[PDB]
Amino acid sequence: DLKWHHHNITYWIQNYSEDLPRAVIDDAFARAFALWSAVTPLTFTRVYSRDADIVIQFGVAEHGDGYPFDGKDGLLAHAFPPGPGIQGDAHFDDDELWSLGKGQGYSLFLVAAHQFGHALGLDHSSVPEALMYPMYRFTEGPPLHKDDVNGIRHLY
Ligand SMILES: COc1ccc(S(=O)(=O)[C@H](CC(=O)O)C(F)F)cc1
Ligand SMILES: [Ca+2]
Ligand SMILES: [Ca+2]
Ligand SMILES: [Ca+2]
Ligand SMILES: [Cl-]
Ligand SMILES: [Cl-]
Ligand SMILES: [Zn+2]
Ligand SMILES: [Zn+2]
Numbered sequence: 423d424l425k426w427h428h429h430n431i432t433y434w435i436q437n438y439s440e441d442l443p444r445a446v447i448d449d450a451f452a453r454a455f456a457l458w459s460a461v462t463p464l465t466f467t468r469v470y471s472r473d474a475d476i477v478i479q480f481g482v483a484e485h486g487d488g489y490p491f492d493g494k495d496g497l498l499a500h501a502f503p504p505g506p507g508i509q510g511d512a513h514f515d516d517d518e519l520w521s522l523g524k525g526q527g528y529s530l531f532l533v534a535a536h537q538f539g540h541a542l543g544l545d546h547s548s549v550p551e552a553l554m555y556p557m558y559r560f561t562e563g564p565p566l567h568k569d570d571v572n573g574i575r576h577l578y
Pocket of ligand 2: 496518
């Protein structure tokens, strides 16, 4: 039930997934963030310290928190809402097949954006076409839906 008191959010990519090249992943995340910063006064800067607002980590099964991943399929990832400590960090189940665009596997890009929303304070949308819909479904074109934009703007 909290939001970031600053608009200069920072993120730190802790480790990577074995499914994609590092530069591919970095870009994916950058583009994910870019989506929100585009409709809000928010900015996202990549840092290299635990001090980052949002820390990005890929994991398998137990990974620190009490919500370990379910291996292939199922829970794909999860991000904690705004707050101190672990709050804000986004976790990805490196047991999934991460990719982009058409084809098998889940889009790291689209999933990231979704999770970044949660890490910004956004809650799940009730619209099937919105990016904040709790159900993954690949789509082409603008990821954000009127509902997602209104949401993030009602916050920032
Ligand atoms: C497409 O964006 C996503 C929506 C839901 C998920 S999830 O399967 O991890 C979701 C939990 C979450 O959004 O973190 C669960 F269905 F409740 C991942 C990516
Ligand atoms: Ca899983
Ligand atoms: Ca994987
Ligand atoms: Ca693919
Ligand atoms: Cl790594
Ligand atoms: Cl994609
Ligand atoms: Zn976690
Ligand atoms: Zn979600």
